Amino acid sequence: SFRFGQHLIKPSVVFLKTELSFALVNRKPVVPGHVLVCPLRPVERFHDLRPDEVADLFQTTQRVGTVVEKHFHGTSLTFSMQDGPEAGQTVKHVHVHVLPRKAGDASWRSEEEMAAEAAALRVYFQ
């Protein structure tokens, strides 16, 4: 019941929802803990977001980064937004990739394993 470009994301894989944003787990996380933070409104380019949505997106991203870094035992974090076709954007919805990083750092999993991961992550936002 969350849009992400032209697909519907099941709530089971969403671990945080705010008044303007939501965070979800990935089917193929690039690194363990690789999650996405998106505005609820499906806009394609970052400049399309209103200031309130910009503040919310990133304050949410900040909270999520802290949680995933902790949960997946990272010691740093990479935050990246591929804003546009020439930056590599595949899904036409603004979103931030949040990746826990460890020193010296296929991944495909079932919806059930994604849902289990989202359930673990929700605990940190209670």
Ligand X SMILES: OC[C@H]1O[C@](O)(CO)[C@@H](O)[C@@H]1O
Q: Is there binding between residue 15 and ligand X (CB under 6 A)?
A: no
95 in active site: yes
DSSP state of 32: T
Residue 94 or 118 having the CB closest to ligand X: 118
Q: Is there binding between residue 17 and ligand X (CB under 6 A)?
A: no
* Residues of the shown chain interacting with a second copy in the complex, contacts defined by CB under 8 A: 46-47, 49, 51, 54-55, 57-59, 62, 65-66, 74-89, 101-103, 105
Binding-site members are 7, 26, 82, 88-91, 97
User: Which residues fall in the annotated binding site for substrate?
Assistant: 7, 26, 82, 88-91, 97
